[PDB]
Every structure is written in C-alpha cells, then in structure tokens.
From Swiss-Prot, chain C:
NCBIfam families for this protein: chap_CCT_beta (TIGR02341), thermosome_beta (NF041083)
GO BP, sorted A to Z: binding of sperm to zona pellucida; chaperone mediated protein folding independent of cofactor; chaperone-mediated protein complex assembly; positive regulation of telomerase RNA localization to Cajal body; positive regulation of telomere maintenance via telomerase; protein folding; protein stabilization; scaRNA localization to Cajal body
UniProt KW keywords: Acetylation, ATP-binding, Chaperone, Cytoplasm, Hydrolase, Isopeptide bond, Magnesium, Metal-binding, Nucleotide-binding, Phosphoprotein, Ubl conjugation
Entry protein name: T-complex protein 1 subunit beta
Residues where ADP binds: G31, G85, T86, T87, S88, S155, S156, G369, E454, K459
EC number: 3.6.1.-
Species of the source: Bos taurus
Assembly: Component of the chaperonin-containing T-complex (TRiC), a hexadecamer composed of two identical back-to-back stacked rings enclosing a protein folding chamber. Each ring is made up of eight different subunits: TCP1/CCT1, CCT2, CCT3, CCT4, CCT5, CCT6A/CCT6, CCT7, CCT8. Interacts with PACRG. Interacts with FLCN. Interacts with DLEC1. Interacts with SVEP1.
Function: Component of the chaperonin-containing T-complex (TRiC), a molecular chaperone complex that assists the folding of actin, tubulin and other proteins upon ATP hydrolysis. The TRiC complex mediates the folding of WRAP53/TCAB1, thereby regulating telomere maintenance. As part of the TRiC complex may play a role in the assembly of BBSome, a complex involved in ciliogenesis regulating transports vesicles to the cilia.
Lineage, opening ranks: Eukaryota, Metazoa, Chordata, Craniata, Vertebrata
Record Pfam families: Cpn60_TCP1
Similarity comment text for this entry: Belongs to the TCP-1 chaperonin family.
Binding-site residues, Mg(2+): D84
Positions contributing to ATP binding: G31, G85, T86, T87, E454, K459
GO molecular function, a single term: unfolded protein binding
Length: 488, 513, 485, 513
C-alpha cells in the first residue's frame, strides 16, 4: 500500500493541528485592538504583505502538506454575500476540534457524535428565526443608513475614534451606487494630513501622478483626453496644440510613455498631461466620463467625451494627489480615507471594502441580526438545555457545539482592552434574560443596547458559516479508530 | 548476480512484512462506514490524492524497497473482469502469511504446503456455484437498474452522503454504453462547484477552453475540424538565418507569405460553413482575427485525449495539413456551444449521431472530500458495467465470506496428511475478513466474530455484518451485494498471489524501457 | 506565509531593545554640549557621513533585523511640519517602553493600559496652552526674532562658536518667507571660503558654474535663457540672441563649442551642464519659460532682470542670480573653516530653516531647554491619581517618562543630572514659565534671557506621534524589511 | 589484487566454496515442486531476468573471482547433445567436494582418490545399457509425442497446474520442425490475459509494430517486401555537403527530387499488388502518406532477427535497392493481419507455403509464473526432439540413480583399496539425488532415502520416487522417463569436470574483473 493514507486519529489529528495554527494569528485580528500582521516569506517572494483581513491572507498561501487550504477556500464564497464583519467564522470551527481529544476518551464510533452538526443545523436556523431583527432599510434612509454595521467592521479597527465618522461616509457612496448600475469602478486611497472630516468625498475618480513641476496648478470645466528633420517633430507639437486650443482641453491622460516636446506646450497652454498612467484607472474613468474612442492623434472633437465638473491637484497634507470629480453618470465613484499613518491604518482598506459588499446584499436580503455578538450568546443559552435532555452520545455532540459559540463574545472582548472572563460572565446573564437588543459594548467595557448604536449583521453571515464550518469538523468524525498520523 | 539474495525463511520475512503493512490501510476502507484518506507525496506530485479504492491507490505509487507492488498489480486484472465492489481481496492474502509462523513448528516440507494452493482452487467450490445469488438484469430495467450494488460500493465510501445519488446515475450511463461496441470513450470530469444533484450527465462530450474574448457565443449545424499540425508557420528545420532583406520591397515578400497562410484557412473554412475548430497544440495568432469575423469558434491547445474521444463521437477526422477540411474530415452536426455549468465556463459538444460514446460531469462543495468524487468515480464506473452484463451477484457485508469459512475448517481434518494442514491454514484466512469489516465500523470486533459465525452456520445467507447496526443483520434489506465475478477471480488471484509472497526476492518485468 | 513570528512577551522584547539602543546615540546629541557622530557604510555609500541631526542619519539606513525603521520614518513627517529644535522625541518614545517591565508586574491585559494614550489625547492641551507661556512672535518682531530657539537648536551642534551667529541670520529668512502661504522655494549650500560673518544672504538663487576662462564678468539688466535640449547652428543662435539683448544663457546639459566663441564677443555669459533641480526652482523664480528648441527665445521665454554676476567668495568663485521679482524663492549661503564640522552646518541648517517658517503661522512657542518638559510632568502626575484607575496606572507611567528629559539635557551639558533634575522641579512648580535648564550655568536659570524658545508645533505634534507610534509597537510584529532566515 | 594469500590445501577450499554456493540455488529447481528465481543486475543489463533453467543464468554472467564458470560453461555442450530435463549434474559435482574433509583425516594419497574418476567411467559404462530404455517414438506419433518427459521437465517447476497443458503443446511445434529443412525460425512470446488453456497456436510469425494511425486495419492475399537499405534518402555515396540552401526560393528544387522517390515506390508497388512492407531500419516520412492511400501496410524499424527468419518462411527475397520488387522477391500470399490477443496488440504473419518455420504464442493467467513459461518452453522444445532421435531412455524420478548407487557400493570394497577408496566416495555421491527429489517433493528426506533403496536393490527398475505419493512408486505408470543421452554424457563429462576442481584453485575468465 503506497502513499500517506490517513483517516481516523490520523486524519483528525492533521485536521486538529491545521486548525490550531490558524486560530492564533486570527484571534488577535478581531475587534478594536485587532492586530495587523505582515507576512514575509523567505524564498519565492520578495516583500511583506500587510493583511489583517483573515479572508485575504489565508487565500494567498498554501504553506503546508496538512489540510486547511480547502477550509480556507470557503470563506471567500461567504465574502460576496456578506463575508465580513470580523473574522470569527474560522476561529469557531477550530475550537470545535479541541473537544475531540476528549472524544478519544469516550472511545466509540464518533459518527453518532456527528449529531453535533445536526445540532449546528437547528442552532443555525434557530438564530435565523429567534430574537429581534431590523425592519428598517427603506432606501437612501435619512440616518439608519449607517453608523451601524460599518461601525462594527470598524470596531475591529483601532483607528475607530475619528474613523467611525468615515464609516458613516461609506453609505453615502452606496446610496449613489445602486439600481441599474453595477457595483463597478470604486476606488479608495488613504492620505497624509489632518482635518475634522479626515476624508473627502469625490464625485469622480482618484489618481496619483503629475506632469512635471511646470503646468497649471488645477483645471475647471475640464476636458479629458485618453490616448492608446527636427522641424518635422514640431509638426507633431503644433497639431496637438491646434486641436487642443479649440476644445479648451484641460487634462490629458496617457497609459504609456510621453514624449518631451508636448510637455513644454502643455505648461503654457494650461493643460495637464499624465505620463504612464495606469490602464486600470483609465477603464474605470471611461465609464465615469462617458467614454471615448482612443486611437491616433485624430482622437479629438466628439470621438472624445469629457465630463467637466472639476479636476484639481490638491495638497491634502503631505503628498500631492490629483482629484477628478463631478461625473454626470454617478455609477462609478471614489472615496478618500485619511489617518495617522500606520499598518493599522491599512486596516481601514479592509473595513470599507467590507462595508460596500454588505449593503449591496442588505437591501436584497431584507433581513439582519443584532451585531456585537448579541446573536451568538442567545443561541448558547438555548443549546445548553438541549445537550443534557437528549439521550446517548448524541448529547456529547450537542454539548460540544454549544460551547464553541462562547468564544465569539470572548474574542470580541479580548481585543477590546478589557478582561474576557468578567465579560463572558456578565454577558450571559443579559442574553438569558430574553433581552435581544442587548449585546457587547466595546466602548463602555460591558454590555448595552446596540440598537442605539445601530450595529447589525447581515442575514447571510449566520447561515453560510454554520453549515460550511462542517468541513473542519466532518474530517473529525468520519471515523476515530486511533492509529498513526504525522503531527506538526 | 546483483545481490539482494534471499531464500526460504529469510525470503519469507520480506514477504511477511509487506502483507501486514497493506492490511491496516485497506482494512479501514471496507463496509458502509469505510475510510477515505488524503495522500501527499511531495517533490514530483505537488497535490492531494485522497483514494477510497484500494486498487486505484495501490497502482499509482511504488513507495518502498520491500516487495508488494507486484501483488498489487494483479488486482487490476481482476478489476478488468469486475475486481471491485469493496476492496477485500488484498486482505485475505495478507493474513495467509501469519499461519506461516505456525508452519515452521510443523516440521514438514514447506513446499507441499504450497500444494495447499491447489486446495485454494478446491476452495473455489465453496464460493462458486454454492448458494443462490441473484435474479433480474432484464436490460434497461425499470428499478433494478441500480440502488443496489453501486450503493454498497459507495457505502464503504464517505462520498455516499450525497454520492449514493451519483451511484444511481452511473447505471444509466452503462445502459447507453452496452452493446457490441465493447467499452470506449466514456469521459467523466469533476467540477469546482455545483448543485444538490452533484452531477449533470451531459448529452455528449464536455471540454473546458475558449478561443478568446472576441468570437461568437454559439454555433449550430456545427462542423468540427481537428488538425495534427499546428496553425503556426515560420522557421522549419533550418532557419536559413534570422533575417533582414537587402532592400525595402523584398521584406514585403516574407510578410505577404503570412497573408497566404491566412487565405487558405478562410477560403476552405467558409465553404464548409465551419462552426468550430479544435487543434491539439499551439494556435497561430493571424487566423484568430479571421475566425472572430467569420463566426467560427476555435480551441487552442486542446488535449489530445479529449480530441481522440471526440473523433470517435463525431465520426472521425483525417488529420493532415490544411488540405484536411471537406470530406477527409467527418463532421457531426448538432450543437456545439460554450455554456456555464453553474460556475466555471465550459464548452459542450452534444447531439452525437453515433451515440456510442457519452460524458458524465460531477459537481461539489470544494474540499478534499470533493476530490473524493474523482477517485470514487473511477470506482463506480467499474462496478456498474460488470454488474448488468455478468447477471450474477453475491451477498455483501461479508455474508459470503463467513459461509465459506464454516465449510473450509471441516475440510482440513477430512483430508489425510499433506493436503490437510495446507488447506486448514487457507481456511482460517477467511476468519479475519469478518473482523476487518467490524473493526472499521467502530463497534467491538470480538463480539462480532462469535455472533456472526452462528448466523452463517445456521444457513441464512442473507444475514451478514451490519456496520450501521453495530451487530449482525439482514444484508438483503440494505441492498448490499457484491459482484459474482470478484469472488471467482479472487480465489484464483489469492492462490497465485499468496505464494508469490512466499517465494520472493524481487520479481520481474515492466516492458522494455 | 512563512516569516519570523513573535508575540506578546517576546515580540515586546525586540521592540524594547530597538528603543533603548537608539536613545543612547541620540541622547548625546541634545543641548549646547551635544556630541557629533560620524558613520561609514560600504556599497551604495561613497564617504563618511556625519550627522548631529538624528532624523537625517536614521532615515538613510536600515542597519539590522530588529524593528525600529517605521518609528524612525515617522519623525520626518513631523520635520516638514517642524521636527527639529533638538532631537528629543525619539528619546521620549524609547523610555515609555521601560514601564512595560512594570506592565508584566500588573499581570493582566496590556491593551487596557493603552487607554493612557487616550489620556495623552487629553494632553497636547495641558502641556502647552495652559501651564507655560510665551507671548510674542507677533509678526516680524523687533528683537524676539532670534537669539533664541536657533541658538538651542545649534546648541546640540559643536558649530556653535561662529555658528550661533549663523543661527541669528536664519530668522531674517522667515520674515521674507511669511505672508504668501507656504514653504517650497528655499535653497541652502555651504562654501569652502572663510569670513567672520560666515554667511551671505542672497536675494535670489546661488549656482556654482562658469562659461569658460573667457567672457565678460558682469551682466546688466540681465535676461535669462534656459534650454531643455543641448547646443550639441551658430547664426541661428546669434540672430535670435542679439535682438533680446541676452545677458546670460543656462543649459541643463552638454554645450557645443562653436556657440561659446560667439557668446564671448557678444557679451553674453552662458552656463554649461547646469543641474535640472536648480533650473526648476529658477523657473518659478524668474516667471518660467518653455525650454524648447532654438525657437525658444522671445515670448516663449521669460526673463527676470536685476543682477547676475560672478563674485568670488572667500577662495572659490560663484555665480549669483539675484533680484527675483516673485520673491517666493530665496537662497542661503553658508561658509566656514572647512571640516566635517562644517558639513555639520548642512545638518544644522535643516533644523533651523523649517522652524522659522512655522513660527510665524503658529503664533505660539514654548520656552526651550526643557522648560516645557518638566512643567508638563508636574501637571500629569496629578492626573493619574484623579482618574479612577485603569486609565490611571497607564497615565501615571506616561507622566514619569517626562522625568528623563531633564536628566538627558543635563547629562549632555557636563553637570550632575540628578542635582539638575532636583533643582529644576522646584522652579517649574513655583509658577515661573521662563525658568528652565541652563546647561552653561550648570543649574536652573531664566531661559528667556539667553533667548531659547521652542516652536509650539513641535510639542503638540510630538505628543500625538510619540504616543500613537509607541502603542503600534506592542501589537505589531515582523515590521516591514527583507528579514531572510 | 597481488597476492591472494591462499596455500596448497586452502587452494582446494576455493574450489570447495564455489561448489557449496551453487548447489543451494539450483537445489530448489529440481523435482515436481520447484521454486523460480529472479535476478536483478546493474551494469550492461536491463530489468530483472528470471531463470528456472540453471544452465541459462550461470552461462550469462561472470559474477565473481572463485572458480566455477569453466565447470558451468561445460553444461551447454551437454545441452546441444541433450541438456535440459532438470538441472541435476551441477548439484552432484558440488557434493563430491564435501567428502574432501573426510579425506584429510584419510592420511592417504589424494591422487589415488582421483582414480575414482577413472572408474567414474564405470558409472558411464554401467548406467548405460543395464537400466530401463525407450524404443518407440516412430515420428509425429499419436500419443507418445508428449504427456511424458516434458511433463517431468515441468515437474521440477511448480507451474505444473495450468502449465502441464502448455508442455504438451510444445511437441506439436517439434513435429512441424522435423524433416530435411533445418533448425530455423522459432519464436515465443507471452500475453497478460487469463484463459484456462493459457495458450494459442499461431500458424505464422508474431511481431509488434505498425505503420501509423492511418492505413487499412488488415490485408489479404498479401505480398511482402523486405529492404536491406532504408527508405531515407539524402546522404548517397557522396554527401554533397551538409548545406541546405541560401534562402527559401531555391528550396523548391530540392523538394521536387523527393517527389520522384515517392513516385518510384508507388509505380512498382501497384503492379505487384503489395499488401505489406517490412524494413529493418528507419523509414522515410514521405512514403508513409502514399502507403495509407494505396492500402498497403508497412513496418518501421522491424527487428532483423525476425526478418531473416521470415525470409526462409515467405520463400525469400533478394534485398537491395528499390529495384528489389516483382520477380527478384518471392512472397507468400495467405493472410497478414494485426490481431489483438484479447489484450496486448501484435501483428501476425500466417499461411506460409514452406511450412518449414513456425512460431508459438503463449498466454498467461496472471503472474511471474508465466514468464516461467518462457523458461519452461525452452526446456520442453529441446527434450522431445532428443527422445525421438536417441531411441533410448532411462527411468526418471531418480529411479536410475538409486540402482546405480547399489551397484557402485559393492565394487569399491571388493577391489584393491588403492582403487577402492576412490570408487567408494563416488558411490555415496549418487545418494543425494534421491534426497533432493524427495526434498522438493514434500516428505521427510530421512524416511524417503531409506524406503527408496530397498525397492531398487530388490530388482525393479520401474520403481522410483513418487513425489505426489511422498513414497516410492512405479515410475512407468506416470510416464516419466529420462533421455538416455542425458545420462550417457553426464557421467563422462562430470568425471573430467570434477577433476579440474580439487587440484586447481584461483582460476577465472577474463581480466577487468
């Protein structure tokens, strides 16, 4: 018999070990004091990637022979419906495995124990019916629009002091982006500087390049041009200007290298040109400006369409950047974030991305549950009764699944800056009482009414995680006759 | 000549160790709650090969120095007559070796113990034409088409939580396939996503490739072109040099030649009404612009295995140089289209006039467990083809094995000297199988042995090992049956294979390399 | 992904060691007795670079595996806003790590302590707004212009013999600079010549080139031509040239020899291979021009006429562009004995140039010499006991961090630091804002009389930077770098 | 390596060690239950050779420094005269060295003992004409063709279950081979598919090659063409340089010349009706297209040994340049087809007018054991031809050996001791064969030797060792007899082979080793 064939302690052990390694990096990731991690791999890579977004980093690397890559793969499917909030789904699945060592002690066919997954099914649907849910989300909405879930996504981030304001801003972006238009060209970049808003909302696309030191500082009623013996050269210079002056051209964007002679002309003319502009920015721009047909210098007049509300290069603080705004279409937009400048700040890139996808499905699902772990504690109180009442080893299955839910309250609290045991202690009493609105308040250090906060979780997050968490655990109970394995 | 010299007992030890190692990995697999395990090999494979079928996994890799690969090789010949169901045959041979320690204490000649192997042929009587087996297999059959044996083969396999449905599907595939044709062009692939059914049973042949973004979405009344030689043209055997030509107007001569190559492809193609072009290799860029405007869909670097299968299905192609079109090419016309299965974009060839060959498509939840379907798929194809045309089956769950065991113990004493001891050791070899079935179950093996024997001795052949139950039950209610053929060949298989292990050192042939 | 992984107690230690190593090198660089440090590297380094200014040397090199480069990187953003004065911000951030040993003694959760940083948010108020004052820096100002902060800024620098005079000069530059809105046109170079003044203030831009050992010395009502393309034909250049009255030609590249004979007879001074960077500033200065082919003259070119001449300075002969109409851009020229200490001036100026531009805009400053530093410590001690407690242990620890600064300033000076710290606190608690550490005295004295003051901006930004940067350290692992192994 | 450091008596030891090493390996080979051995070597070999025939493996390899190959080399001359049957002669020679230890304490002139070999001719002239004999074998013969000695040759080999049937087949092969025509063109190969018969008789020659994917599947009324020179054209007597052409304009002239080679082959081909072309070497690509359209099957790189044999079979041909077709070549037109032996593909040439040369194809149930058939077949082919030609035989199963042993023991003692001691040592040497026959039989050796001697001493020549019985039985009833020639020349040759052993040490083959 060839190859390494493992199922029993052998499969379970490897599954066990894969889950424990992932949980330690991820646990610090969740909540207000969530920690940013940068990964550098020695060999076959040359830089450190900053991602404290659990979904993004896990997808990127297939580090070991032990099983975990497939478990990792299913999270992204989750991340398109809701996906986000905080990365808690992976952590819960991992701890479920730890009780399995206890299971070897009971030394029997563990498949009967598989009933825990059945238990997961009732518990999953139970949280889909029991408690209070939002009835709002009218469309546009005066202020139930945000200050809610994005804030919870933001809760996972330290930057959430001035930032909670920024989170509010993201819904304005979604309100403009809904209906017939698809969830297309959305661009966000953080910047160096300090103001009350700590962010500006553009009515257009944001780019980072400059023609040269010479040229007009900014342009208004702007026109945009996008392009795919020495005396003879001058003819190229003049044709450009002759076509240029009549239009009133204010800005030129070129995907590739730009010839030096025209640069001189642009400065005097009052026209801003961009050398080697990135192609991806351009495609988003075409949808935004109304598009144009890009070919040879014949491109001018009406083959070119150009929006003109306002194009300017503005110092936001440290580094100069160029702002395109006021697109007539409204389908494609850009949001500019600001911060104190840290890896923790790059964390915000995750948060907003997390926020845009969630609202798209918030209107479509018309269903939500309370955030801050309110949903999770309530399920736990109900499941505890269930374990003892049922007969057999089935009860063992049911009891272990129930205690898994305990960690979410603990994980949010641990990164809070407050002691988890007391938190776990106080939290359970409130939820048991039958008070659904009450949950974990990171800001107050204890428990409070999150309805006021407005924090809510989208309906899709609870149903996909609970059913799919099974892969981590199914491997555990296929059989447990305990023989070999190759631990790590 | 060439060291590694072993004889008698020294030879037995290398042999003895190989048999014990194989049994523990394979033991887990047998029965309704069997085992599926993930294989990593590193350096030359770089992926997870989790295999349920003992036969499939054993053939793929020759892991170590001790001899066992040859014993493994023999199982496939058994498979190419049926040798599947649930893997049990390898285990019987392994336990044969344990009695050998007993044999040294015997103090007789060890090589007429070997004559015991002819006894194994005699043992064939116990499992052959002994006990009623099955009825049915009318042809096309309304309800006996499946939900029987495939389900049991699958029962030992984990995938059966959703795969038991897949198993039912496979006989539909055999009904279309069976006839004087024999067994060709059955193409089956696994998909990285899907629905509850987890399989879609396509009308014809399924391939996954696209010409490029520019080109028409569908073609109908389709013509198919297959070429041995690529579209690419230039260098030949001898470059003649990397060239620049002596002036301005001769550069044009080389450029012009490329245009002709374009011209031949369009002129021949348009008359035929060419809907799709499939080439097993690199495709030259110039023709690609042409195909888009024409309304023709081409496939770059199509796999040769897919192409040959397609040729049988379409009606064949004579694959030569650009003269290849019109009648040297036989094109079947129905529909060729690129469709999305439910996730990834694939191209479907269907509506084949021949009808001889068909394609099965599988879908899943994206895990190690999903790749399980790929291996189990191979396992399923073998069971169903044989079950319908052999018109014979035996009760599963080890029911057949215990009944045989009761009769064999009696036989050894009955014979006189030399014949008696050899045959008895073979007889006890049947006893481990009941134990192996129960052990993977998660239920107590010792309890199982005494209760099991009592039901078989009594005469009720239906009773067997019920893993779901944890005790002994009625096998027939389950619908668990084993192909008749697996038992007939295994008895012959075990006899020749078991003593291979008793004579060992390092056995021959592979085919000259 | 692989990497090197450290967490909670072990990760903190690596952070701990990086902070302590930096503080010892930087501590010697504070106040009138600051020590000059010299460094050498091989590969992309050409020669020994010696920098008093902590920010300049730290930015240049990421020497080893331990984490510290990002903390270091941050100080420069502060520098554009102000940064300098004396390097102390790095020291305060470093010492806050010492209380971490105390945190293990706490034995619970390091995150809760982090609340003190919020308490610091309350700060940047009580430090300077309240407690210590400076009422002045009204605008331009007759005598508070200098003989103040620059002297302290240069105190850390050994140059301060002749150099303190140089420092006085720097505030004159700010006065012209203030009004329009922002800094982006100041150029500073050092010369190999020597004089008591040790510096000349140029009303325009300074460049170091000559046409050749021929051509007129002086041009009048000068017109300036800048060309993108090289001169590498004779008649076209002269015909266009004569009509303009062309006094000087500057080309950013190789120049062709035939033209050169013509320029001398005409009475036109040309510059060969003038650096592009100098030219770009000149364009803003002179109104700019479009530097095209030989169609360049007349209208596409703009020229500023005042005085362009070659004048010897000390030893070397330099060419002076001056009298710019715009007024936005100005050039500072420094001269000295000619030693690594002289190069120290290059390090030293990027410590005073930035401060002054900011001094007019803030309209606020604080007394220097650590006067602000001890007073803030007295105020913060009260805060720890008043806040109920979680925010208190953390807050008290921050307060004691301020105690080291008085000690570091004294240590540099050549006096017993504890005695110094001791005498210092009594004067600050008294209510006299002006009183501070007088290193020359060896005791405490009136900071205002010898003039030292610190920009308001340095203290308010540092509080935000030192604190927030320090907390990222406890949670952050690996830090951006190559890290093979 | 310089000085061996062995002295006079120890010189004897090197001979002594060589004899003991060889006897154990050959020991399993003898008698109805024998073991098959596989050898693996690195250094100018290939992949594992398996030899049941002791003579074949010993002859092929010069493994080590001690003397033995010269003894070994001798067995082949025996093989031409008779050879095979079972390998026993090597075993007896090795045994005689064991008594030499007894001889050292026998403070007696060792060379006198040599006279034993002088009287070893007594075994030579006494075994001959005083025991058994065969007098039949008329020619072809209805039942004496086999089911005799070949079965005995096979008996030494375990395969005797399915295999004894195969041995019977071999005589059919010898009968067709007999007449005034010569010993030419015999070829045997095995197939990996199971059948009870395990063999098929092919009327013609078997080869395994094909023209390509295109071409008619089979041909009928076939004409065969063999070429001494390759289809490839360019080199000629004078190369014309290794050039090509300075552009692609002038490339056309060279290409045109190629077409003429294509034309000559078709013109000559069509008139003849040519159905198959066989060439021993590389085949040029251009003609390949021609053959497919014409309907002619050609073979690329055909092996020369098969070809030469084929020529005798087809009536032959004169192979030279392309002038070679029509009358210069003679072809046999019965049937040439590529047929699948239910498994691995191969091509069959059949219906030869000459009848002089024929080929045997064997099929295997599934094991190492049927490569054994290659091993076994060689033994069966040679033995039967000898039985008819010699017109003499002796009883098998060791019947001959015990009788002679009884006769030898009396002569030594009753003659003068100088000639007596030598003779007596020789006598007990014959004793081991009875022991080895029983040893591989399955019964205790001690009991067997004892019961054996009493029956032979009494006077029944027919009685011998019945391995199936485990005791002594009537040899004649089982039909086992040994060719008279195997006994006749072994006694003479063994006597002169053993003599070279005691006196001479170091000896071996060629240098580099």
């Amino acid at each position: 018999a060839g190859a390494d064939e493992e199922r029993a302690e052998t499969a379970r052990l490897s599954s066990f070990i894969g889950a424990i390694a992932i949980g330690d990096l991820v646990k610090s990731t969740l909540g207000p004091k969530g920690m940013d991690k940068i990964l550098l791999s020695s060999g076959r890579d040359a830089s450190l990637m900053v991602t404290n977004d659990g979904a993004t980093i896990l997808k990127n690397i297939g580090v070991d022979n032990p099983a975990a890559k497939v478990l990792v793969d299913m999270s992204r499917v989750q991340d398109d419906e809701v996906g986000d909030g905080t990365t808690s789904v992976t952590v819960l699945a991992a701890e479920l495995l730890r009780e399995a060592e206890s299971l070897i002690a009971k030394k029997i066919h563990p498949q009967t124990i598989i009933a825990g997954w059945r238990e997961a099914t009732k518990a999953a649907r139970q949280a889909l019916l029991n408690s209070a849910v939002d009835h709002g989300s009218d469309e546009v909405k005066f202020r139930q629009d945000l200050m809610n879930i994005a804030g919870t996504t933001l809760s996972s981030k330290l930057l959430t002091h001035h930032k909670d304001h920024f989170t509010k801003l993201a819904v304005e972006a979604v309100l403009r982006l809904k209906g017939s238009g698809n969830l297309e060209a959305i661009h966000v970049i953080k910047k160096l500087g300090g103001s009350l808003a700590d962010s500006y909302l553009d009515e257009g696309f944001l780019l980072d390049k400059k023609i040269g030191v010479n040229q007009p500082k900014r342009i208004e009623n702007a026109k945009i041009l996008i392009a795919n013996i020495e005396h003879a050269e001058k003819e190229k210079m003049k044709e450009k200007v002759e076509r240029i002056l009549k239009h009133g051209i204010n800005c030129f964007i070129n995907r590739q290298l730009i010839y030096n002679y025209p640069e001189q002309l642009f400065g005097a003319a009052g026209v801003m040109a961009i050398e080697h502009a990135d192609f991806v920015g351009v495609e988003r721009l075409a949808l935004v400006t109304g598009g144009e047909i890009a070919s040879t210098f014949d491109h001018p007049e009406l083959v070119k369409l150009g929006s003109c509300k306002l194009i300017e290069e503005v110092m936001i603080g440290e580094d100069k950047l160029i702002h395109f705004s006021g697109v007539a279409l409204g389908e494609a937009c850009t949001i500019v974030l600001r911060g104190a400048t840290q890896q923790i700040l790059d964390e915000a890139e995750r948060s907003l991305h997390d926020a845009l996808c969630v609202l798209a499905q918030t209107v479509k699902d018309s269903r939500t549950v309370y955030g801050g772990g309110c949903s999770e504690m309530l399920m736990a109180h109900a499941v505890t009764q269930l374990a003892s009442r049922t007969p057999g080893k089935e009860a063992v299955a049911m009891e272990s699944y129930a205690k898994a839910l305990r960690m979410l309250p603990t994980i949010i609290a641990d990164n809070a800056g407050y002691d988890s045991a007391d938190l776990v202690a106080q939290l359970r009493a409130a939820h048991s009482e039958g008070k659904t609105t009450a949950g974990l308040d990171m800001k107050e250090g204890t428990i409070g009414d999150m309805s006021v906060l407005g924090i809510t979780e989208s309906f899709q997050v609870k149903r996909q995680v609970l059913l799919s968490a099974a892969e981590a655990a199914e491997v555990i109970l296929r059989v447990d006759n305990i023989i070999k394995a190759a631990p790590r």
